[PDB]
Structures are given as C-alpha cells and as structure tokens.
C-alpha cells in the first residue's frame, strides 16, 4: 500500500488517546454564554456567525452544526483540540449545545476575513507569495501533527487582509493519517479534489492537501477561478487530464494498479500535456514568473508521492523574498 513520504508514524508513536476521537468525552460549555450577532457564511454542514461572549464581551465565531453523526463532531473537536494554538490554525475556544434541540455549536476566536471572490482579484504578486507561504505554515504544522485537512480551498482560508493574518478553517472533513489506512474518497470540494479521489486511490495521505493548494495557487496567479472547472467528479478528472495530459495519468494508474471505469475512460480520452505558459495573458502576466510556474508544476502531479511536501514548498525559490522578510525579525 502507499504510505506518506513524511510524518508517516506520527500517530503510531502518539498514544491512542491522541487519535481515538470516537472515544472523546465532550465537555459541554454554557450555551447561554454566546450570542449571535450577524451571519458570516454557510456550508453543507454548518452555518457560521459572528458572535459575542456575553460575559467578557469579546467577539467570537459561532459555528452551528447541521445534524451529523456524533462520531463526526467528535472528530472535528478532537482535531481542533490537538491543533489548538498552532500557526495559522483557527482556534477553538468552547463547545456548547442547545439543551432543547441538542444542536451543537463550536466557538472560535474571531477572524475578520474578506471573501476570496473580492480579495483574490486584487491580490498583488507579493501578497500571493505571502499568503500562500502563511497557508503552508498551517499545512506543515497540521501534517506534522498527523492530521490531513482534506478540504483546502479559498473558502476555508480566512484572510484578514489589513492585519495580514491568515487562518485555515473548517476542520470538519479532516482526518488522522494512519499508515496503511484506506480512506473515504468523498472528501474535499470538487474543484480541489486530487486525482487520487477521482480514481479511487483510497490509501492517500497529507499530499492530498498539496494538490488542493496547487489548485488554489493556479487559480490565483492565472486569475482563473476555479482553475479545474469540472461539473461532476468524473468531469473533474477530464478537466485535469486536458491540462496535465493522459500519459502521466496512465503511468499513475499503472503504478498503483488502478483502472478507470469504462464510462470514465471514454470521457478522459487522450491528451497532450499543456505547458503552464499557455495560461499566461496580459491580465495575469504580472503574477506569473518562471519561479511561480516551477512551484506550481511541482504541486500539480498525478502521483501524490511526487508532489512537494509543505516544507519543500516553503523552501522553493518562489518564496525567497518572503523568507527574507520573515527572517528579518
Ligand atoms: Cl470521512
Ligand atoms: Cl507536508
């Protein structure tokens, strides 16, 4: 079976209580301590509000969970607790539930974000480098803690642009990496699904997040959102194969002893690899450098084992100036 290149044994060496989220005994706080103020966003599994702690008067984020199995809620809480206070990770403060409806809410430290549909079209070259580097800090940290996010996308990256603060949010799809485990492939969101999810390679690992990051990065530097625009999970692989080419897909399927369903094989067809330079135009040229292309190229590989790790990405020349600005302090 496939195994992670890095952080392979993190959860083998940690005690069972670290990763056994199903056994979690949730310590419920006071539902009355937090009041909603205004709605911030919506999702398939929750609605997110700006709130206030009525005692301290501090602002918070209140995430009200739609009905889901207890095991899934315990998974998100356990992971949030295990990552609490890590770099650029959203910070869980409290867990409460309504005593009549039993609906649970997760309480987070407040983040004053700007929606990516407004922010990304105004991001400069340096800000793309800065924010992707900040996101890589979050991914290297959570991966080092034995956790895959499995839903990296612009909506789950809250950026406070005036403070230049970034938080990786919504850990409701995240899982613990266990070497040798076959995971559910119905994770992430369509446009950011790695080829492993689309070809039924279940023994995937942290590198799934690095594919999703590459999709985000491509969307930013080419001003093409989303970059891989599929209309369903099968079409999503078609859109990928029309860019990366089918030769390396076929090699990938052979290496892992996979074959496409005949219905999917007909859709994928045969395609040459398209050079990244084909996506440059006058409107986005100021964001595309040789270094940006090389970095993107090393993220978007069919073979998850060939993708940069978060640490390798941070070391790429594309971030040279960001690292220097950070080193100076
Ligand atoms: Cl799952
Ligand atoms: Cl990594």
Curated annotation (Swiss-Prot):
Keywords, comma-separated and alphabetical: ATP-binding, Glycoprotein, Kinase, Nucleotide-binding, Nucleus, Serine/threonine-protein kinase, Signal, Transferase
Quaternary context: Heterotetramer of two catalytic alpha subunits and two regulatory beta subunits.
Top-level division of the source organism's lineage: Eukaryota
Record keyword Metal-binding present: no
Reactions catalysed: L-seryl-[protein] + ATP = O-phospho-L-seryl-[protein] + ADP + H(+); L-threonyl-[protein] + ATP = O-phospho-L-threonyl-[protein] + ADP + H(+)
Gene: CKA1
Parent-protein start and end of this portion: 77 to 405 of 409
Activity control, per UniProt: Inhibited by heparin.
Enzyme Commission number, as recorded: 2.7.11.1
Residues of this chain annotated as glycosylated in UniProt: 112
Classification of source organism: Eukaryota, Viridiplantae, Streptophyta, Embryophyta, Tracheophyta
Subcellular location: Nucleus; Nucleus, Nucleolus
Free-text disruption phenotype from the record: No visible phenotype under normal growth conditions, but the triple mutant cka1, cka2 and cka3 show altered circadian rhythms and delayed flowering under long day conditions.
Binding site residues for ATP: 40-48, 63
Biological role: Casein kinases are operationally defined by their preferential utilization of acidic proteins such as caseins as substrates. Phosphorylates casein in vitro. The alpha chain contains the catalytic site. The tetrameric holoenzyme CK2, composed of two alpha and two beta subunits, phosphorylates the transcription factor GBFl, resulting in stimulation of its DNA binding activity. CK2 phosphorylates the transcription factor PIF1 after an exposure to light, resulting in a proteasome-dependent degradation of PIF1 and promotion of photomorphogenesis. CK2 phosphorylates translation initiation factors.
Membership in a protein family: Belongs to the protein kinase superfamily. Ser/Thr protein kinase family. CK2 subfamily.
Domain Protein kinase: 34-319
Recorded GO MF terms: ATP binding; kinase activity; protein serine kinase activity; protein serine/threonine kinase activity
CC per GO annotation: nucleolus; nucleus; protein kinase CK2 complex
Main location: nucleus
GO annotation, biological process: regulation of circadian rhythm
Top EC class for this record: transferase
Name of the molecule in the record: Casein kinase II subunit alpha-1
Expression (tissue specificity): Seems to be present in all plant organs. But seems to be less expressed than CKA2.
Residue numbers annotated as active site: 151
